[PDB]
């Protein structure tokens, strides 16, 4: 009924509004990573590659998505590039998110070998090998998995296109078995479940390790209570062998390697008294541990539970990015499955189709907002840039 120019004028104005915020937002992220030296870690090299794929949305993907909506006349091998360039961009964001999840898992499971396993020179190479495979995954329709060989000649004659030209529409050049099996299932859904399995192993490793330092502290504070309330030298010997193993395993620096060394010294000095026969002398040597327990060991566990809880806060922030990438791209993929798995169902309405395309494009703006709300370093560099560069 209504002229298609009225409906499409709403779409282009909304598309150009997303392109403005996708270039303005992610350019502040890339600018802060090179303006600040605290943001130049390996984890943020994948953040830049994520923002570089969200800048390309406002430069190429959104302008391409407008042209394909008009259904203009184009060669069926050129119409594929306008249609499938987004699939390369979505494939790079998935590979970057997957690299951030394993980067945070290597740092939480192996904190003493991170600086040797995960280096910047190796990260720049992993990024280059992901972009190549992103073009191989997103542009593999052009390799021969097309509907170009089966043209809709009813729409090509009405449009009045040339020889070898097809009315350039998305669902008329790339088949749906590619969008559901290869694109959604094998290349989007499986890596999404892997990030959910990697992140669950991050909060599980931290939750087990947060309980270990408190179990050790509980062991060192109550076995000490057994010493001053003991009636035998062997009862003091038993409590010390546990306090020596628990402390040495609490050890697994700045006053760290010194105060813990005072603990093992006083313990082993009280072990020779209990094994010799002097009970009252060993119970007095164990009270010397209380001072070190309130000066060095209390300040080690205080910082260990502080650095381990911030890795819980930081991993939760990056996990929301995986949750917002799915909430913005699954609605478009679910409509695809209805079109392919239920031929008896009617197609989704066009207002819902372009609602799923616009929503999937709004994913290029949410990421710089998560950094400014849940990362203090990014929130301060941004404020430093906006106030100074004005
Ligand atoms: C910043 C740079 C890389 C952007 C330039 C790439 C763009 C503008 C180029 C590269 C490939 C080109 C497309 C490939 C083939 C065709 C088929 C033709 O019948 C209509 C134009 C169309 C659809 C071209 C439009 C312009 C195009 C999309
Ligand atoms: C959190 C996110 C994933 C929620 C996604 C909700 C969307 C993608 C779901 C919820 C209800 C679904 C719709 C329910 C029924 C129909 C009618 C059918 O003839 C076409 C598909 C269509 C229109 C479905 C498309 C997908 C749909 C719109
Ligand atoms: C959080 C992630 C895993 C959600 C994944 C949802 C996908 C894999 C599932 C959830 C609901 C499912 C759809 C629900 C109903 C129908 C209608 C039926 O006639 C054909 C299959 C179809 C279209 C299903 C296809 C697969 C489907 C879209
Ligand atoms: C982990 C794996 C095994 C489960 C997830 C795969 C699911 C979501 C996919 C894989 C194969 C798909 C099915 C393949 C074909 C059909 C027949 C069609 O008439 C109804 C939809 C239906 C039934 C699809 C529904 C969704 C489906 C079951
Ligand atoms: N199904 C689909 N359609 C479109 N646009 C075509 C909109 C349309 C759909 C039907 C119709 O008759 C006329 C126009 N863009 C699309 N992008 C995607 C997509 C991108 C990433 C994953 O799925 N799926 N998708
Ligand atoms: Na992206």
| Domain co-membership, 193 together with 224 | no
Q: How many residues does the chain have?
A: 390
Range of the domain at 315: 1-210+303-390
Distance 328 CA to ligand 4 centre (A): 22
Give the end of a domain, one of 302, 317, 336. 302
* In contact, 22 and 51? CB cutoff 8 Å: no
- What is the spatial distance between Cα 102 and Cα 121, in angstroms, rounded to a whole number? 17
Which of 259, 231, 226, 257 shows the shortest CA–CA distance to 243? 226
Residue with CA closest to ligand 1 atom 19: 74
Q: Which residue do the tokens 């192996």 mark?
A: 110
Dist. CA 212–CA 380, nearest whole Å: 34
Task: Point out the domain boundary residue: 235, 269, 302.
Answer: 302
Report residue 150 as tokens.
């089966």
Choose among 372, 369, 380: nearest CA to 36.
380
Distance (Å, whole) CA 270 – CA 275: 9
Whether residue 378 contacts residue 26, with contact meaning beta carbons closer than 8 Å, is answered with no
Structure tokens at 235: 């009862």
Where does residue 82 rank: exposed (0-12), middle (13-18), buried (19+ CB within 10 A)? Answer: buried
Solved how? electron diffraction
Ligand 1 contacts CB of residue 82 (under 6 A) = yes
CB within 8 Å of 81: residues ≥ 6 apart = 64, 139, 142
What CATH number corresponds to the domain at position 196? Answer: 1.20.1070.10
Kindly state whether residues 168 and 222 are assigned to the same domain.
no
- Distance (Å, whole) CA 377 – CA 366: 17
| Nearest by Cα to 367 from 48, 15, 37, 4 | 48
For this entry, resolution in Å reads 2.8
98: Cβ–Cβ under 8 A, 6 or more apart, which residues? 191, 194, 195
Q: Which two tokens stand for residue 292?
A: 């070190």
Whole-Å CA distances, 168 to 9, 81, 149, 273: 19, 11, 14, 89
CATH of the domain at 234: 1.20.120.10
**Does residue 89 sit in the same domain as residue 108?**
yes
**d(C-alpha 313, C-alpha 156), whole Å:** 55
Q: Using CA atoms, how far apart are residues 67 and 86, in angstroms rounded to an integer?
A: 13
Per-residue H/E/C for the chain: CCCHHHHHHHHHHHHHHHHHHHHHHHHHHHHHHHHCCCCCCHHHHHHHHHHHHHHHHHHHHHHHHHHHHCCCEEECCCHHHHHHHHHHHHHHHHHHHHHHHHHHHHHHHCCCCHHHHCCHHHHHHHHHHHHHHHHHHHCCHHHCCCCCCCCCHHHHHHHCCCCCEEECCHHHCCCHHHHHHHHHHHHHHHHHHHHHHHHHHHHHHHHHHHHHHHHHHHHHHHHHHHHCCCCCHHHHHHHHHHHHHHHHHHHCCCCHHHHHHHHHHHHHHHHHHHCCCCHHHHHHHHCHHHHHHHHHHHHHHHHHHHHHHHHHHHHHHHHHHHHHHHHHHHHHHHHHHHHHHCCCCCCCCHHHHHHHHHHHHCHHHHHHHHHHHHCHHHHHHHHHHHHHCC
Answer whether 147's CB lies under 8 Å from 171's CB. no
Question: Residues 245, 336: contact at Cβ < 8 Å?
Answer: no
Burial of 214: CB neighbours in 10 Å, binned 0-12, 13-18, 19+: exposed
**What does the block give as tokens for 201?**
């192993």
What tokens does 130 get?
A: 């992901």
CB of 75 sitting under 6 A from ligand 1: yes
Looking at 302, 334, 355, the residue that finishes a domain is 302
Q: State the total domains in the chain.
A: 2
Pick the closest to residue 340 from 229, 214, 221, 179 (CA basis): 179
Following CA atoms 19, 20, 21, 27 in sequence, which dihedral angle do they give, to the nearest 10 degrees?
100
Minimum CA distance residue for ligand 2 atom 25: 335
Minimum-distance ligand 5 atom for the alpha carbon of 188? 22
- For residues 15 and 358, is the Cβ–Cβ distance under 8 A? yes
Asked if residue 173 and residue 40 are part of one domain, the reply reads: yes
Q: Do residues 71 and 173 both lie within one domain?
A: yes
CB 156 within 8 A of CB 166: yes
User: Minimal CA–CA distance to 66: which of 159, 168, 164?
Assistant: 168
| CA-proximal residue: ligand 2, atom 6 (nearest) | 331
- Is residue 356 within 8 A of residue 11, CB to CB? The reply is no
332 lines ligand 5 (CB under 6 A): yes
Q: Please list the residues that pair with 73 across neighbouring strands.
A: 167
Distance between Cα 232 and ligand 6 center (Å)? 69
Query: Vertex 156, ends 171 and 346: CA angle to 5°?
Result: 35
The breaks in the chain (C to N more than 2.5 Å) occur after 252
Cα–Cα distance list, 163 to 51, 71, 77, 115 (Å):
40, 16, 13, 59
């Amino acid at each position: 009924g209504a002229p298609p120019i009225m409906g499409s004028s709403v779409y282009i104005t909304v598309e150009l509004a997303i392109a403005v915020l996708a270039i303005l937002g992610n350019v502040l992220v890339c600018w802060a990573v090179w303006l600040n030296s605290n943001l130049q870690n390996v984890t943020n090299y994948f953040v830049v590659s994520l923002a570089a794929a969200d800048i390309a949305v406002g430069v190429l993907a959104i302008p391409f998505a407008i042209t394909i909506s008009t259904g203009f006349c184009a060669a069926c091998h050129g119409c594929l590039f306008i249609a499938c360039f987004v699939l390369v961009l979505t494939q790079s964001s998935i590979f970057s998110l997957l690299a951030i999840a394993i980067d945070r898992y290597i740092a939480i499971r192996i904190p003493l070998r991170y600086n040797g396993l995960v280096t910047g020179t190796r990260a720049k190479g992993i990024i280059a090998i992901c972009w190549v495979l992103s073009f191989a995954i997103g542009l593999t329709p052009m390799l021969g998995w097309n509907n170009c060989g089966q043209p809709k000649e009813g729409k090509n004659h009405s449009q009045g296109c040339g020889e070898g030209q097809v009315a350039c529409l998305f669902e008329d050049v790339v088949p749906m078995n590619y969008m559901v099996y290869f694109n959604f299932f094998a290349c989007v859904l499986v890596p999404l479940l892997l990030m959910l399995g990697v992140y669950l192993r991050i909060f599980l490793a931290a939750r087990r390790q947060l309980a270990d330092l408190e179990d050790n502290w509980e062991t060192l504070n109550d076995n000490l209570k057994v010493i001053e309330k003991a009636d035998n030298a062997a009862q003091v010997k038993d409590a010390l062998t546990k306090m020596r193993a628990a402390a040495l395993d609490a050890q697994k620096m700045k006053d760290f390697r010194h105060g813990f060394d005072i603990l093992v010294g006083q313990i082993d000095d009280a072990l020779k008294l209990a094994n010799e026969g002097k009970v009252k002398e060993a119970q007095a040597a164990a009270e010397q541990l209380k001072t070190t327990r309130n000066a060095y060991i209390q300040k080690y566990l205080e910082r260990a539970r502080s650095t381990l809880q911030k890795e819980v806060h930081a991993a939760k922030s990056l996990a929301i990015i995986v949750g917002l990438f799915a909430l913005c791209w699954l609605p478009l993929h679910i409509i695809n499955c209805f079109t392919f798995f239920c031929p008896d169902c009617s197609h989704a309405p066009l207002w819902l189709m372009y609602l799923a395309i616009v929503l999937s494009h709004t994913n290029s703006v949410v990421n710089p907002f998560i950094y400014a709300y849940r990362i203090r370093e990014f929130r301060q560099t941004f404020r430093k840039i906006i106030r100074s560069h004005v």
